[PDB]
Amino acid sequence: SGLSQITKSLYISNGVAANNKLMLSSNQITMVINVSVEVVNTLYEDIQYMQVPVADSPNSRLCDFFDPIADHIHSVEMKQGRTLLHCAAGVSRSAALCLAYLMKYHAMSLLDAHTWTKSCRPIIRPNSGFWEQLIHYEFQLFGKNTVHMVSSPVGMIPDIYE
């Protein structure tokens, strides 16, 4: 239950780490973005909190928060702060917002944003609906895609998953 650092000012974690006061202060976290409906945050002093109430479902419109949250992460960085994006497990919901942010502010293709994030936090795995949303957002940002949904015995998956 630790913090996976993604950039100089962005981290991803599960719900346990997100309420670990020492871990937040030691990593100089100033902004906590809870991407879940169900996780409750303990509100520590001098840390700002907010919540994006989405369930980890392929139907959840996380996409409506791609741009607004990406800009929020960027503003925190501009103000010399650091942001922790977390959900319940730090696997699907927070990971998807992180990918959107990397594409918008680090000029990375969806594929490169995923390779990078996966290297920082091995267990990330957005659900298939979030992948479709990320692919649509990638197309919006670059007019081209580097990840594509394909059929499989388990249903639609990003080609990245084979």
Side-chain angles (χ1 to χ4, degrees):
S1 292
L3 270 45
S4 303
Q5 183 165 27
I6 312 307
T7 71
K8 63 177 193 172
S9 72
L10 180 66
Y11 301 71
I12 295 174
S13 83
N14 65 356
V16 182
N19 289 146
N20 183 324
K21 189 180 182 181
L22 284 180
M23 198 164 284
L24 295 174
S25 56
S26 78
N27 286 277
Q28 290 176 276
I29 304 304
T30 58
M31 183 72 216
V32 174
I33 302 183
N34 176 348
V35 197
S36 81
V37 176
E38 81 279 13
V39 184
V40 168
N41 284 117
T42 301
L43 312 182
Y44 298 118
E45 226 52 280
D46 297 326
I47 295 179
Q48 190 190 322
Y49 298 79
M50 76 175 278
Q51 188 156 357
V52 181
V54 298
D56 178 36
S57 159
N59 305 304
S60 294
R61 299 180 60 60
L62 237 196
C63 55
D64 299 335
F65 296 88
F66 286 173
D67 274 311
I69 293 299
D71 297 341
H72 194 301
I73 295 167
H74 178 64
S75 298
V76 170
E77 178 175 281
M78 296 313 274
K79 303 213 165 193
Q80 303 303 302
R82 298 189 192 190
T83 304
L84 167 66
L85 269 173
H86 80 88
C87 48
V91 166
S92 186
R93 288 171 287 188
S94 55
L97 289 194
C98 174
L99 299 183
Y101 165 75
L102 290 175
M103 291 193 289
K104 186 176 185 170
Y105 284 97
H106 284 269
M108 292 172 92
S109 62
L110 180 53
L111 177 61
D112 288 345
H114 175 267
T115 305
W116 175 270
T117 302
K118 170 91 170 179
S119 296
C120 299
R121 188 180 177 74
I123 64 178
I124 61 147
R125 175 159 284 239
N127 70 57
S128 289
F130 292 168
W131 274 109
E132 288 163 39
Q133 285 167 46
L134 286 168
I135 286 168
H136 178 260
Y137 188 51
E138 182 185 30
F139 184 72
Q140 294 184 300
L141 293 172
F142 308 106
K144 155 197 173 183
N145 284 129
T146 54
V147 179
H148 317 72
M149 299 305 286
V150 299
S151 314
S152 87
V154 177
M156 301 290 265
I157 61 181
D159 44 24
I160 293 178
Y161 296 166
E162 250 52 64

